[PDB]
């Protein structure tokens, strides 16, 4: 039912994915030390992941496990991204 | 509606809900994780 929740997660993912994909793309191209163009993008990404994680996904359903398992994957990437960000800042 | 593997290429190159949408996001996250870990 409360699957509006599982959606709210997916919308946040869509954004995280966009922003972080751009970050990685830039990050990957820049030499060293103009890598700092990615920063803006990691930040916006990180922010989307965090809003994703925040969503309480409350319910029983095999689909609901799947959503929360998704939030866990966002957690994993929130952390790796913050790590990379810090390395760049 | 769109084949989920199309969705993923779309999303990946910045172009153009339900249990299928979740499969998309799940796979896209895994890709992010692979992509970040490569950076080390």
The CATH number linked to B28 is: 6.10.250.440
A67 close to A57: Cβ distance less than 8 angstroms: yes
A53 close to A71: Cβ distance less than 8 angstroms: yes
> Cα–chain-centroid distance for residue A1?
25
A65 close to B21: Cβ distance less than 8 angstroms: no
Does B15 reach chain A within 8 Å, measured CB to CB? no
Put simply, the answer to whether A80 touches B26 (Cβ < 8 Å) is no
Look-up of token digits 């890598």: A35
Token output for A81: 């991204």
Does A38 reach chain B within 8 Å, measured CB to CB? no
How many Cβ atoms are within 10 Å of B25's Cβ, its own excluded? 28
Total number of domains in chain B:
1
In whole angstroms, what is the distance from residue B35 CA to residue B40 CA?
A: 10
A24 close to B39: Cβ distance less than 8 angstroms: yes
Put simply, the answer to whether B22 touches A67 (Cβ < 8 Å) is yes
In whole angstroms, what is the distance from residue A46 CA to residue A23 CA?
A: 11
Q: Could you tell me which residues come within 8 angstroms of residue A82 by beta carbon, excluding any fewer than 6 positions away?
A: A46
Q: Which domains does chain A show, CATH number per domain?
A: 2-89 (1.20.58.80)
Q: Could you tell me which residues come within 8 angstroms of residue B40 by beta carbon, excluding any fewer than 6 positions away?
A: none
């Amino acid at each position: 039912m409360g699957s509006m929740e599982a959606e709210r997660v997916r919308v946040f993912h869509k954004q995280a994915f966009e922003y972080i994909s751009i970050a990685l793309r830039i990050d990957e191209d820049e030499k060293a030390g103009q890598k700092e163009q990615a920063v803006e993008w990691y930040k916006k990404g990180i922010e989307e992941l965090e809003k994703g994680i925040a969503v309480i996904v409350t319910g029983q359903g095999e689909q609901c496990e799947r959503a929360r398992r998704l939030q866990a994957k966002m957690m994993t990437n929130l952390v790796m991204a913050k790590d990379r960000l810090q390395l760049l800042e | 509606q769109v084949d989920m593997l199309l969705q993923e290429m779309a999303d990946e190159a910045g172009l153009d809900t339900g249990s299928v949408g979740t499969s998309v996001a799940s796979a896209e996250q895994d890709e992010l994780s692979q992509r970040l870990a490569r950076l080390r």
